[PDB]
């Protein structure tokens, strides 16, 4: 495959990048405390946003409301308004970096985790903590919504990746029904499919595990083998049978989901690749690394 360029930002290291569902704009949250917003067809830089101190991990817009949400290493989950540009309110309540944070498509909720071994649920109309899920024994690297159940899928160091029941929560609001064993290192990502029953997690293994469950049990299916330091990101190509990974080894790789097996490696000679986003409709795709973002659509070879 090859990687079609749109748009690439030159700055601080990219620590996560959100994709606006309507319009061409990326949300990048920076080591440097700031997020930058990009409109990526123009290349202009519309606005910027200081509202934390040290990296910024978590970065996401609201499907539908004029909001995103920031998650950053000093534990604030804040909330804003980009057409009013300004910060609406600080969501207290994480004791150390949060490393994620998402709105969910249909409940007014924002989810967070955090390297403080927990993952938060915030009802962002009232402003409240509804729940705290616990059980994982090291940082939280990363939390998920499931698109269509009430589950939540979580990665952790403690080498574990957890599907949650959170049908309680949605009417003993939240129970742990997967405890997922198989990463012999910490697990940094995890990512559902978005029609599909699949599950991905990437780790200091420097593996990336395929899980499919149903509503009573879930498997490992394969694992694609190959990256040679730590897999910070992976996702699932939204429109193709394809999975992606990013990782320390400075690389991007495309696997084939059907046979878990290398179909494109792109590297970067000097920078290590933090996170990696798709667009939830178009073939589009981000990349944040040491030396900022990269905006490009995946094409196969000499099309």
Same mark, same amino acid.
């Given at each position: 495959?090859?990687?079609?360029?749109?748009?690439?930002?030159?700055? $601080?290291?990219?620590?996560?990048?959100?994709?606006?569902?309507?319009?061409?704009?990326?949300?990048?949250?920076?080591?440097?405390?700031?997020?930058?917003?990009?409109?990526?067809?123009?290349?202009?830089?519309?606005?910027?946003?200081?509202?934390?101190?040290?990296?910024?991990?978590?970065?996401?817009?609201?499907?539908?409301?004029?909001?995103?949400?920031?998650?950053?290493?000093?534990?604030?989950?804040?909330?804003?308004?980009?057409?009013?540009?300004?910060?609406?309110?600080?969501?207290?309540?994480?004791?150390?970096?949060?490393?994620?944070?998402?709105?969910?498509?249909?409940?007014?909720?924002?989810?967070?985790?955090?390297?403080?071994?927990?993952?938060?649920?915030?009802?962002?109309? $009232?402003?409240?903590?509804?729940?705290?899920?616990?059980?994982?024994?090291?940082?939280?690297?990363?939390?998920?919504?499931?698109?269509?159940?009430?589950?939540?899928?979580?990665?952790?160091?403690?080498?574990?990746?957890?599907?949650?029941?959170?049908?309680?929560?949605?009417?003993?609001?939240?129970?742990?029904?997967?405890?997922?064993?198989?990463?012999?290192?910490?697990?940094?990502?995890?990512?559902?499919?978005?029609?599909?029953?699949?599950?991905?997690?990437?780790?200091?293994?420097?593996?990336?595990?395929?899980?499919?469950?149903?509503? $009573?049990?879930?498997?490992?299916?394969?694992?694609?083998?190959?990256?040679?330091?730590?897999?910070?990101?992976?996702?699932?190509?939204?429109?193709?049978?394809?999975?992606?990974?990013?990782?320390?080894?400075?690389?991007?790789?495309?696997?084939?989901?059907?046979?878990?097996?290398?179909?494109?490696?792109?590297?970067?000679?000097?920078?290590?690749?933090?996170?990696?986003?798709?667009?939830?409709?178009?073939?589009?795709?981000?990349?944040?690394?040491?030396?900022?973002?990269?905006?490009?659509?995946?094409?196969?070879?000499?099309?």
């Amino acid at each position: 495959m090859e990687m079609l360029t749109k748009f690439e930002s030159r700055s $601080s290291a990219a620590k996560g990048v959100a994709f606006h569902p309507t319009q061409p704009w990326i949300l990048t949250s920076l080591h440097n405390g700031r997020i930058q917003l990009w409109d990526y067809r123009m290349g202009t830089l519309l606005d910027r946003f200081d509202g934390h101190d040290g990296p910024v991990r978590g970065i996401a817009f609201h499907p539908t409301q004029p909001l995103f949400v920031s998650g950053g290493d000093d534990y604030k989950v804040n909330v804003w308004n980009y057409k009013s540009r300004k910060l609406l309110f600080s969501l207290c309540g994480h004791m150390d970096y949060v490393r994620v944070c998402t709105f969910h498509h249909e409940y007014p909720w924002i989810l967070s985790c955090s390297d403080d071994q927990t993952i938060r649920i915030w009802n962002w109309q $009232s402003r409240n903590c509804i729940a705290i899920l616990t059980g994982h024994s090291h940082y939280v690297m990363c939390a998920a919504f499931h698109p269509s159940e009430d589950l939540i899928v979580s990665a952790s160091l403690d080498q574990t990746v957890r599907v949650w029941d959170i049908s309680g929560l949605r009417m003993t609001d939240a129970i742990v029904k997967f405890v997922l064993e198989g990463h012999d290192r910490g697990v940094n990502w995890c990512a559902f499919h978005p029609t599909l029953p699949l599950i991905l997690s990437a780790g200091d293994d420097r593996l990336v595990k395929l899980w499919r469950m149903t509503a $009573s049990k879930a498997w490992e299916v394969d694992t694609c083998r190959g990256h040679f330091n730590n897999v910070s990101c992976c996702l699932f190509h939204p429109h193709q049978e394809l999975i992606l990974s990013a990782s320390e080894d400075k690389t991007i790789r495309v696997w084939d989901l059907n046979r878990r097996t290398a179909v494109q490696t792109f590297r970067r000679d000097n920078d290590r690749f933090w996170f990696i986003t798709v667009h939830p409709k178009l073939n589009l795709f981000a990349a944040a690394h040491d030396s900022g973002v990269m905006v490009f659509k995946l094409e196969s070879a000499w099309s």
